[PDB]
Scaffold this active site. Structure first.
Site, PDB file in Angstrom:
ATOM      1  CG  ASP A   8      -1.863   1.284   1.134  1.00  0.00           C
ATOM      2  OD1 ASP A   8      -2.205   1.715   0.004  1.00  0.00           O
ATOM      3  OD2 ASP A   8      -2.216   1.825   2.204  1.00  0.00           O
ATOM      4  CG  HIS A 838     -13.333  28.241   0.359  1.00  0.00           C
ATOM      5  ND1 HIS A 838     -13.089  29.539  -0.038  1.00  0.00           N
ATOM      6  CD2 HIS A 838     -12.419  27.474  -0.281  1.00  0.00           C
ATOM      7  CE1 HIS A 838     -12.108  29.550  -0.923  1.00  0.00           C
ATOM      8  NE2 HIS A 838     -11.678  28.310  -1.082  1.00  0.00           N
TER       9      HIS A 838
END
Length: 1362
Positions: A8, A838
């Site tokens: 991974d 935002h």
RNA sequence: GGCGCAUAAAGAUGAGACGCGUUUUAGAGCUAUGCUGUUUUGAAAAAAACAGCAUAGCAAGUUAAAAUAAGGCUAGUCCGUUAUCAACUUGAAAAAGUGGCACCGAGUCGGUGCUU
DNA sequence: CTAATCGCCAGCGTCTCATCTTTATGCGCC
DNA sequence: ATGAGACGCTGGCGATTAG
């Protein structure tokens, strides 16, 4: 025995795990060198490599262009000084010497300290009559008196050292320099053009409405607002949008069949202007020259000085005006302060660390900071008033050299230079001779396509030399072959055909490439007649028929047109049935229509004999941009077209490159056929095989000649090749890391390749609906949105997606002209004036995408400034957001974030440390790693020329391993320790190998490279038939994934029991034991020993902090230059230590200087490295060491691992600081408990099981104090936090009364005290617990050094006791 | 797993330029008051500064030069911050070479059987 | 007057030009 | 008819404090 490996990977980590046949991590004892007692250590075969993120090259690059800027500027000064060399000696023998030594103190100054004249009085005189350089500027420009040669040098050199930008092509003679004149003449032109509807200003002041300190779009808003009935989209409005430097469009103004936008800023604007104007005719053209000089007069907004007729040096005179108003307002302010607030005068005009006028002038405070500081002081006085006005208009005591001069073009500087010279060339002969030389010094700019003027010593240069002379600003057009150089400039970046290695690639506007894509995409369109029994592909003659009828007539032809304008006109079929393309065609023939619209003759272009000439022409229009270069390149084809046609031809220019060669398209022929690929796509008879079928056909000859590609086994080391890849160097680090790690694993495990290698890919399988929904082009999402909502907002103000690409406008049409907070009607006027806010503050995560942005009237109507819109707004706008949700306008993530407020707002748990670039970088490194290992492991081929797969490279989606952690109570909480990487590696390995043993007929789809078709369409051919694979494939992924489960619950209907083994009958092999393997997983997840290793890497980069510090009484200061004493000149600070060096010798002590034996860590900086590594003993002796054991010199990088007592480890952070070197090995019970209790993933399912996990939460509440105990023993054993652990404990007892969930989230927050690495701060509730840093590296000196491998299996340990 | 094409979201590399910033120095600051070498006047008492330093009241304050990784040799109006790197054995470098198998256990790995 | 805490700091902003990836879906194929 | 996937300053440095 046999084994497999799971991985991974990420920009910071390489998670590695080794499973066996029974899914168990193998254990082995490894030998240990050095001189310690542990000769052997039994460890496990699972861990994770940690390493610093590989950096991009943007930073290094920026520093590089900077270096070049400075060397080149210095040389420009040198050319101008050299011109004055012979004459200055007659005027002043040591002028340039004094100027070159101006930085030095008088103590080290070679000649006089006074720069200009050397004496005192004259220098004072210059500073007197010319306070700034701009007074001398104006004087020399205006006056025609024979001034001093030195002053001429100063003016000229000041102009040259700071020339200005080259953004504006041509030259700007200070024309009207007033908005008024050019606007009156302009309005005059607009009225004279159209008697249809002349619109007047009716006396509206332009020179304040266009000189306002704001957005260009904001200026435009008010401007189009002055005359009602005139739209901002109007011919006048679009034009005044063009004057403001925006990007307008007249496609809706002049009703052009095609889109046509213009912009003053871009350099193709002249060719585009001739192009569009000759396209609309010689009629409307003066409006645009008027707009050009208009913008020219609007540019000097902050620097416009009264009238341009006062003098011939407007910029300089304007600066003088700034100086004067400054003086007046300064004396003014002083008087006022001494009058009204006499006690603060001593602070304002004297204190330098207080943002007063002293902080403004002598201090480091800015104009902005200064304004903020004096504003309340001004308004608290009764006078002022106008000074406040100068402050808001920002022209209060403004200095001369400020930031807004980035707008100054070089043309005005050149003007003052030319003026001084023409006025001074009547005295001195040499500058009358070299006025054009100096003008050349200021004007010279290296074109971008030429690049560095190197002589073969740069990996960045490409320029080719016509001569071999030293390139000067004067012989530049001749010494440098601009042609071959621009050509090679674009050619050094373009790719080659992947199929045809030694071959280049056709442009994106290549007629051959466009024909390629039309025929390849048109070779599979099947037709079914209302009377036809089976679909039949379009015949050879038919394809060509379509092309000639529609594809050469319209820019792009739709399927509705092919059905209505072809089938009914040719086949004359009542109804059509198309089976290959939807809505419209992907491929198109744009270049052909551009051409047919330019040369206006179809017969030449339709001709096949011309394709070589045509292809060379497109290649020419793509490789070059310069009109002269392009015009010269096409003199060979000037006999075929008219002069007016050659103008029209050179005006069009193209950008971009395709993916395939020309030899691939219409070049490689077949032996049996004798025709090329292009022909086959154009006609193959019964079977119109596609490009991919053509390449992959034993029936043709192509596969045989392509196998002749290149050679993979050429001289390429196990490195090099990684560093020879395309893209950023940021990836090469991660890849090399994971592969060297894997190679080490195999070097350990029986020296034979494992069964499989499984990695996790960021590519997951979305549904068809979502994939088309996120990917809907903007007019599409908007139009579908408003049609579903039902508003006629599109009917009130219509714009196409061409002019829609502006941000606040996209949001405006997305939100249907209504504020997302306020419930009011938004307006098109103050558009840039409205704030874009935002959803989740920029404090939490970095997102610039629209999923996070919203257009509002004011961002304060959001609620809180540090969180998701307050519940006050959410519970008043929930209906509008949901209704915006039903219009398919806003995303699911957006509605979830707007509604996250009522869900609990934003905890400190939403840390979000990722930056999207780390994600595409992970995608890059994974896509690369997958095909590298696939080839490093599979080397041999069979008897039929096909590769042997001893080891299979497997691609697992993140969703599978993730859902696997979620559906089996195997949760992951990263902040606990860095084991979650190894856990991801192990889980990927286990799930992969168990998967290929469970169902092998479909295993070809998961492995990298080989694959069986095994069409999924035929897999779930349901009566519904949703199609698109996507939708079918995700459903296929869950379907295959549940066979691994213990109980099967369907979303389809009813239930199903699963066999406890679920083994496959065809294999006859037990694939999984539902009783014992999960327990090995339970052990592994609870395993203490996990090999975690940080790549011990030597620090490189900048020498030190770049901030130049003043003179100081310290030894910490670094010489900025060689002779520049940091004690008398000031220097650098904070040098970055490359790597620490272990030394042992003797130093002096006391006044008698006695030699005592010492050993310690020396900090070797980067600047010092080359010098230390050359003569090390000599370097150490110079440092102040004597009798040094050379064989007792240990080289220690950063993160050098150390151990003292009770398993307590420390990592070498520097030559004087350490880092936490231990991981908290916490049992699974506590981990999962923390997961369920902290609410980490909203744990969605069936409400029943949510309450069951909740009951388990309410019951094992003692886990809290137990966890506190793990952390406590662990902090007391390793961390040595003394006070901090105490502050933490006191804080946990104070908030023992808080709800369970919070205590879970903040207990999670507490792990950072026990986190591996540098110590950083954190909070438990409001109690900020700062960091306990280890400031002395003295304990390391007699501990035990641990040199570790990349997986940390082969440990060599050293007892630092000598 | 892989191509090409169209749409979309996110990134990357190289080149040419501006504008700031910062750092030393140049922009003869003035007046009253305290410490000091003396000279200088004086019978002494007591100051005149020749200068250096400390304390108050005002004066002004916008500009410039040069540097902007130390530097490097191959000397170009070039290059100098990205990638590379545990330890050990040969090697100038490149690179090559260096670490036994099962079982019982699991607090950062331990124990036991086997075998060099 | 040491020696470990505390508190502070970190070169930035703009424009012109060119070529490259990486995922997700859609229309075809190994 | 899905949410995770990407991960997160920190080492130099001067002045404040504790002994």
């Amino acid at each position: 025995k046999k084994y497999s490996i799971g991985l991974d990977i990420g920009t910071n980590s390489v998670g590695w795990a080794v499973i066996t046949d029974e899914y168990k991590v193998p254990s082995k004892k490894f030998k240990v060198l050095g001189n310690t007692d542990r000769h052997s250590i039994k460890k496990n075969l699972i861990g994770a490599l940690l390493f610093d993120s590989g950096e991009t090259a943007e930073a290094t690059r920026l520093k590089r262009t900077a270096r070049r800027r400075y060397t080149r500027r210095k040389n420009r000064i040198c050319y101008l000084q050299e011109i004055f060399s012979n004459e200055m000696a007659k005027v002043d023998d040591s002028f340039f010497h004094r100027l070159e030594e101006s930085f030095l103190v008088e103590e080290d100054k070679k000649h006089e300290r006074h720069p200009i004249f050397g004496n005192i009085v004259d220098e004072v005189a210059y500073h007197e009559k010319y306070p700034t350089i701009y007074h001398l500027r104006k004087k020399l420009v205006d006056s025609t008196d024979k001034a001093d040669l030195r002053l001429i040098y100063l003016a000229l050199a000041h102009m040259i050292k700071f020339r200005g930008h080259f953004l504006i092509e041509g030259d700007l003679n200070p024309d009207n320099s007033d908005v008024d004149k050019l606007f009156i003449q302009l309005v005059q032109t607009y009225n004279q053009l159209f008697e249809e509807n002349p619109i007047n200003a009716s006396g509206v002041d332009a020179k304040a409405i266009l000189s306002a300190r704001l957005s260009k779009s904001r200026r435009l808003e008010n401007l189009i607002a002055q005359l009602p009935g005139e739209k901002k989209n109007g011919l006048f409005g679009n034009l005044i949008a063009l004057s403001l430097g925006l990007t307008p469009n007249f496609k809706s103004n002049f009703d052009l069949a095609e889109d046509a936008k213009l912009q003053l800023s871009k350099d193709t604007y002249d060719d585009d202007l001739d192009n569009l104007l000759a396209q609309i005719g010689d009629q409307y053209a003066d409006l645009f020259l008027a707009a050009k000089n208009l913008s020219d007069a609007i540019l000097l907004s902050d620097i416009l000085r009264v009238n341009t007729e006062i003098t011939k040096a407007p910029l300089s005179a304007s600066m003088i005006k700034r100086y004067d108003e400054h003086h007046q307002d300064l004396t003014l302010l002083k008087a006022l302060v001494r009058q009204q607030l006499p006690e603060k005068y001593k602070e304002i005009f004297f204190d330098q660390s207080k943002n007063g006028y002293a902080g403004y002038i002598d201090g480091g405070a800015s104009q902005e900071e200064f304004y903020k500081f004096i504003k309340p002081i001004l308004e608290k006085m009764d006078g002022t008033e106008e000074l406040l006005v100068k402050l808001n208009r920002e022209d209060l005591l403004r200095k001369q050299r400020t930031f807004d001069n980035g707008s100054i073009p070089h043309q005005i500087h050149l003007g003052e230079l030319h003026a001084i010279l023409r006025r001074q060339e009547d005295f001195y002969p040499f500058l009358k001779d070299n006025r054009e030389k100096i003008e050349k010094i200021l004007t010279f700019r290296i074109p971008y396509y030429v690049g560095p003027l190197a002589r073969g010593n740069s990996r960045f240069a490409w320029m080719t030399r016509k001569s071999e002379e030293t390139i000067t600003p004067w012989n530049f057009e001749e010494v440098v072959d601009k042609g071959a150089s621009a050509q090679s400039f674009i050619e050094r970046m373009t790719n080659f055909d992947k199929n045809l290695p030694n071959e280049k690639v056709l442009p994106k506007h290549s007629l051959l490439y466009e024909y390629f894509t039309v025929y390849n995409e048109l070779t599979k369109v099947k037709y079914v007649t209302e009377g036809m029994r089976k679909p039949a592909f379009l015949s050879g003659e038919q394809k060509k028929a379509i092309v000639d009828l529609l594809f050469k007539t319209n820019r792009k032809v739709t399927v509705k047109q092919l059905k209505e304008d072809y089938f009914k006109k040719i086949e004359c079929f009542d109804s059509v049935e198309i089976s290959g393309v939807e809505d419209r065609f992907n491929a198109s023939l744009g270049t052909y229509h551009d051409l047919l619209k330019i040369i206006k003759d179809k017969d030449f272009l339709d001709n096949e004999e011309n394709e070589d000439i045509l292809e060379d022409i497109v290649l020419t229009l793509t490789l070059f941009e310069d009109r002269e270069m392009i015009e010269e390149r096409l003199k060979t084809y000037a006999h075929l077209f008219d002069d007016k046609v050659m103008k029209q031809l050179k005006r069009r220019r193209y950008t971009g490159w395709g993916r395939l060669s020309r030899k691939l398209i219409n070049g490689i022929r077949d032996k049996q056929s004798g025709k090329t690929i292009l022909d086959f796509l154009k006609s193959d008879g019964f079977a119109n095989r596609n490009f991919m079928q053509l390449i992959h056909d034993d029936s043709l000859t192509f596969k045989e000649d392509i196998q002749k590609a290149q050679v993979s086994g050429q001289g390429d080391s196990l490195h090099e090749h990684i560093a020879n890849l395309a893209g950023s160097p940021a990836i090469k680090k991660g890849i090399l890391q994971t592969v060297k790690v894997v190679d080490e694993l195999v070097k350990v495990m029986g020296r034979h390749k494992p069964e499989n290698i499984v990695i996790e890919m960021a590519r997951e399988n979305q549904t068809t609906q979502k994939g088309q929904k996120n990917s809907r082009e903007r007019m599409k999402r908007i139009e579908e949105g408003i049609k579903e909502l039902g508003s006629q907002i599109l009917k009130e103000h219509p714009v196409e997606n061409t002019q829609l690409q502006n941000e606040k406008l996209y949001l405006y049409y997305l939100q249907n002209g209504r504020d997302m907070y306020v419930d009011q009607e938004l307006d098109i006027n103050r558009l840039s004036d409205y704030d874009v806010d935002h959803i989740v503050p920029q404090s939490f995560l970095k997102d610039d995408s629209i999923d996070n942005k919203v257009l509002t009237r004011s961002d304060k109507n959001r609620g809180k400034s540090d969180n998701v819109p307050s519940e006050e707004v959410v519970k008043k706008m929930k209906n509008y957001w949901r209704q915006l949700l039903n219009a398919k306008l806003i995303t699911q993530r957006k509605f979830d974030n707007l509604t996250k407020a009522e869900r609990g707002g934003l905890s400190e748990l939403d840390k979000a440390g990722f930056i999207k670039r780390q994600l595409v970088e992970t995608r890059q490194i994974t896509k690369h790693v997958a095909q590298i290992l696939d080839s490093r492991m599979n080397t041999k081929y069979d008897e039929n020329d096909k590769l042997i797969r001893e080891v299979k490279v497997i691609t697992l989606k993140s969703k599978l391993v993730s859902d696997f952690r979620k559906d089996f109570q195997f949760y992951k909480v990263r902040e606990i320790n860095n084991y979650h990487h190894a856990h991801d590696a192990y889980l990927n390995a286990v799930v992969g190998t168990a998967l290929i043993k469970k169902y092998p007929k479909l295993e070809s789809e998961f492995v990298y490279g080989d694959y069986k078709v095994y069409d999924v369409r035929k897999m779930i051919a349901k009566s519904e038939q949703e199609i698109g694979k996507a939708t079918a494939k995700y459903f296929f992924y869950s379907n295959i994934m549940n066979f691994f489960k213990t109980e099967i619950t369907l979303a389809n209907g009813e239930i199903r029991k699963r066999p406890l083994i679920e083994t496959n009958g065809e294999t006859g092999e037990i694939v999984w034991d539902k009783g014992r393997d999960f327990a090995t997983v339970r052990k592994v997840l609870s395993m203490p020993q996990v090999n975690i290793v940080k790549k011990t890497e030597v620090q490189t980069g900048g020498f030190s902090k770049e901030s130049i510090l003043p003179k100081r009484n310290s030894d910490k200061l670094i010489a900025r230059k060689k002779d520049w004493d940091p004690k008398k000149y000031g220097g650098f600070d904070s040098p970055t230590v490359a790597y620490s060096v272990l030394v042992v010798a003797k130093v002096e002590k006391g006044k008698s200087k006695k030699l005592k034996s010492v050993k310690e860590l020396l900090g070797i900086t980067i600047m010092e490295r080359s010098s230390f590594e050359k003569n090390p003993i000599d370097f150490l002796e110079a440092k102040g060491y004597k009798e040094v054991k050379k064989d007792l010199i240990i080289k220690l990088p950063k993160y050098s691992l150390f151990e003292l007592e009770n398993g307590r480890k420390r990592m070498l952070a520097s030559a004087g600081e350490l880092q936490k070197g231990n991981e908290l090995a916490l049992p699974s019970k506590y981990v999962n408990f923390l997961y369920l209790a902290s609410h980490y993933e909203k744990l969605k399912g069936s409400p029943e099981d949510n309450e069951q996990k909740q009951l388990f939460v309410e019951q094992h509440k003692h886990y809290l104090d137990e966890i506190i105990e793990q952390i406590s023993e662990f902090s007391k054993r390793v961390i040595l936090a003394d006070a901090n652990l105490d502050k933490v404990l006191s804080a946990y007892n104070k908030h023992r009364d808080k709800p369970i969930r919070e205590q879970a989230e903040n207990i999670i927050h507490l792990f950072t005290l026990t986190n591996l690495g540098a110590p950083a701060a954190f909070k438990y509730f409001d109690t900020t617990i700062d960091r306990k840093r280890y400031t002395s590296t003295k304990e390391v000196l007699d501990a035990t050094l641990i040199h570790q491998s990349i997986t940390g299996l082969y440990e060599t340990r050293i007892d630092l006791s000598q």
